[PDB]
Design a protein around this ligand. Structure first.
Ligand SMILES: N=C(N)NCCCN(CC#Cc1nc2c(N)ncnc2n1[C@@H]1O[C@H](CO)[C@@H](O)[C@H]1O)C[C@H]1O[C@@H](n2cnc3c(N)ncnc32)[C@H](O)[C@@H]1O
Ligand SMILES: N=C(N)NCCCN(CC#Cc1nc2c(N)ncnc2n1[C@@H]1O[C@H](CO)[C@@H](O)[C@H]1O)C[C@H]1O[C@@H](n2cnc3c(N)ncnc32)[C@H](O)[C@@H]1O
Ligand SMILES: N=C(N)NCCCN(CC#Cc1nc2c(N)ncnc2n1[C@@H]1O[C@H](CO)[C@@H](O)[C@H]1O)C[C@H]1O[C@@H](n2cnc3c(N)ncnc32)[C@H](O)[C@@H]1O
Ligand SMILES: N=C(N)NCCCN(CC#Cc1nc2c(N)ncnc2n1[C@@H]1O[C@H](CO)[C@@H](O)[C@H]1O)C[C@H]1O[C@@H](n2cnc3c(N)ncnc32)[C@H](O)[C@@H]1O
Lengths: 261, 261, 261, 261
């Protein structure tokens, strides 16, 4: 079908892209980076996150594949030496698609902006002290004082969420997980402490208490938002689709990245 | 229908049981503690856990209700002053049933024993050093050295799991969560560290490395098991059913128990 | 002697300052905010931290006292109703002095700047990814990747250090304590994880790996530093002196702020 | 002088002991395991802990040395190939002594027993729920509910203390550090959470609330104590002395054991 290939842009990744393009030319494969059906990302997880966001408006028409030219990625989980076998198996098609949940972020002003995250969305203050009221399904749950909050997809749980103490969640679970960044807890100030895992259709809303300027990140993108009234998180109805050609289970991917490989 | 009432056995709880029994006698309600359809537990979460285990072989025919005569429970979430309104609404029926996941534990010797947990199951060594190989869906994930492991239901996530650093999980999510107890981590010894959340149909198996004697707990019950070859955890196909008469959301129950009430 | 009084600047604190000034006028007490020997801070810990920094160049000639007009402070540990008894006991003198350690921070460019902290000093990146080599007494200890690092005095251990997982340290111990902010840890990236407690005369140095711009905080002051070659932490030879009129032990102060009061 | 050598008792360690004994016979060295002045431990940290306890009543007359025949130890920090150079440098003497703090544990009944720990002392319940009142210098600090408590020396901070979230403390600091094992924390139950570091002459006392039977461990030794009224921890006035022949700094030892070697 139509395909395209992003590269991290170092010499290794560019030349592997040029070779795969050449191998694709020997099949009924057309390079189209406007409406691809296959997006191959060559580089690391940062390169893969860029490719997701380049094509986030055509998620349902696209299957993604990551090739790691450095260390193993959680998303970029094919090796460079497998690239020619990848070209072949994929020109034919007849591959399985695997789908992972995404996180929808809505930011409301005094106007709305929506974003999709594959790893996580985080909120930190814009200089002052971060204080937000945390409301779950319209129920006021807690007043959070500290550095910030992190809302993670299942496949993001091994990224920032992990470094914050979060649980690792199998990506077949349709959920999102909220972790704390350095909460204050004393006599007058109380947060839950524990990470929180929310199912589909639960809405977690962050509302400002005084300062209304926040630094909001979505995966690698970090935007200073002013005059913010609300930040709403829920599990997205949209999913990212991977093309799979072999069994590479999530927990094995986890063992390989963190225990040893 | 047929009903029964367990009491914590202090004066407050016994007398509230006697009064509810009296109120039930004014309806088509028959006290039967052999085949009840309604099990009311009066006391705290420990009393409720006992009632679950007393009737674990008739989970599908029974709806449970907890009355907390001390502080609020996660399971025992009606107040004593509501008891007469409880008698009434429940003689009529026309109540909704709510179902929470359970954890199946299988212990294999060199023979099998199965247990159901509403809170969690834990494994600790029987005196020596605890070392177990942790295998996920037949894939060797890690060699765990430390005090022990805890496998939690969703509604157990606010119990022992919470004190071990685990995430709180909404009980609509069909999953189980594994936390570490004091793992050793140095140059030669590596565990994941993070809690792990597993979906339905994933099997987590613990296999001994040297010592084969373990202390296995299931909720409040703690059994020394000898000549153990394997401990297998999976989300149960069975569920516990609660009778609900009002909206009392899980996250509100969490806010009330941990943030303030 | 010579004294001065800072106020948080709300009505409560201003008027308590005016009343204490009036009470001092009935003794051989002269208000001098250029070379005081007694500095009274009225407000909270933030007000007390400001007063420390206003007079950091005359630490050895000054005894400090904090009055908390809001909740109890760790530094501002007298109540407003005790103020008149404070005026009296202090005009006479004959009070004990108590001394707490401070943290020296040195920032080197390509030039040096020194700062003293009563709570802590922290380093975070200026937008990009924070990567620093951590060198202890000229020995390369670790390469830290993550959000940042926090170096705490003993009396700062109940502040930011606490929210980062650090240990609480009795202020009679001449030490400093380093905690991590969200470290990355996988196959290729390793930090110690644990907080580290250093004695006097140990030098902890942070050296940039790529980006050389950092946000460095000292207590409440936060400065963007450019062209930074090194950040050096050691226990200061200078100490802050408190005037004490009663026994109020540190662990009791800790119990009162965090367990209940 | 008089010396002796303990072995882990596998073939490697026994034969290295026999060779060092032979090398010592070529000097004015007499093997005496009743009143040695030099105690060499061959094996790992467990072997070294045994040697400390074998000779705990002659700590001040003895210098200790550890040889690691397996991985590097924190105590057993010479390699087997250095053994002949060790024999030589040590027959001459003219070595520096290095001293580390120890922890005194006192257990009172209704009678007293004292123990010295080089790593830590821990208290866990004997089957039931562990509840103890924690009293610091006769001030009631907290009521601890959970699995247990761990009191660590500075050189023990890299052992059990580390796995419990404690800080690593340089052994020149005369202190002890208390960590929690799985504390319960909700609306009605509050502990500090953070590790606590205590200086010399502070006394931390654990007093039973209901159950008075506890499992008390001291380093590798674990004793069930009945009819316990109190457990008192303080930094010992006694110290353990190491013989040093080279610079091997603590933080380097830490880097080598946990970061990589
Ligand atoms: N929160 C933001 N963004 N900035 C707040 C600015 C003013 N702060 C003054 C203070 C203090 C203080 N010293 C102690 C002490 N010695 N012991 C125990 N309480 C203590 N306070 C208490 O800390 C609470 C918050 O302030 C109040 O209750 C105050 O009672 C500056 C100080 O904040 C600290 N700080 C900054 N960010 C965080 C964070 N994420 N988590 C925890 N503390 C944080 C840091 O340690 C700095 O010095
Ligand atoms: N693991 C069980 N159930 N019992 C093991 C019995 C023998 N132990 C001897 C030792 C040691 C030691 N001292 C240090 C030190 N000073 N610094 C850094 N390494 C150190 N070791 C290392 O600890 C590892 C395990 O042993 C080895 O690698 C050894 O290299 C007794 C000691 O175990 C410690 N221990 C007990 N239970 C746990 C646990 N759950 N987590 C962490 N440590 C634990 C405790 O602190 C005790 O004293
Ligand atoms: N580190 C800074 N300041 N910015 C880095 C920018 C580029 N990042 C791309 C990625 C990724 C990624 N996804 C996963 C995944 N799904 N699973 C497991 N590894 C994963 N990586 C790995 O994360 C490491 C660092 O990047 C690499 O090894 C990469 O292999 C953006 C992403 O960083 C994450 N991030 C930001 N800050 C921190 C932090 N303090 N601690 C931990 N992660 C952090 C965040 O989750 C964001 O989306
Ligand atoms: N504490 C000891 N040694 N044994 C106590 C025996 C009786 N327990 C009944 C219960 C419960 C319970 N379920 C929940 C829930 N679903 N959600 C939130 N609260 C919950 N409770 C609360 O847990 C507190 C303690 O009990 C009470 O307040 C009760 O309200 C058995 C249960 O203890 C739990 N447990 C055991 N040891 C620890 C520990 N170290 N830390 C934390 N919990 C622990 C474990 O999860 C087991 O099932």
């Amino acid at each position: 079908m139509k395909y395209m290939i992003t590269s991290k842009g170092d010499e290794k990744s560019d030349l592997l892209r040029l070779n795969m393009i050449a191998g694709f030319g020997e099949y009924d494969m057309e390079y189209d980076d406007v409406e691809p059906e296959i997006v191959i990302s060559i580089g690391g997880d940062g390169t893969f996150l860029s490719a997701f966001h380049q094509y986030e408006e055509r998620l349902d028409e696209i299957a993604f594949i990551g090739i790691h030219t450095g260390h193993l990625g959680f998303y970029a989980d094919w090796r460079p030496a497998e690239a020619d076998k990848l070209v072949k198996l994929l020109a034919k098609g007849e591959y399985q698609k695997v789908s992972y949940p995404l996180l929808k972020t809505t930011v409301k002003y005094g106007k709305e902006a929506t974003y999709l995250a594959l790893n996580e969305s985080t909120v930190k203050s814009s200089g002052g002290p971060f204080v937000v009221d945390v409301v779950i399904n319209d129920i006021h749950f807690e007043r959070f004082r500290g550095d910030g909050l992190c809302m993670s997809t299942p496949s993001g749980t091994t990224a920032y969420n992990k470094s914050l103490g979060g649980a690792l969640m199998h990506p077949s679970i349709e959920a999102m997980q909220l972790t704390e960044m350095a909460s204050i807890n004393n006599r007058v100030y109380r947060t839950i402490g524990s990470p929180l895992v929310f199912p589909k259709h639960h809405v977690v809303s962050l509302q400002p208490v005084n300062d209304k300027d926040f630094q909001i990140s979505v995966d690698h993108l970090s935007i200073l938002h002013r005059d913010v009234q609300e930040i709403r998180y829920e599990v997205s109805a949209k999913k990212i689709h991977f093309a799979r050609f072999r069994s590479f289970p999530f927990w094995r991917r986890v063992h390989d990245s963190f225990i040893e490989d």
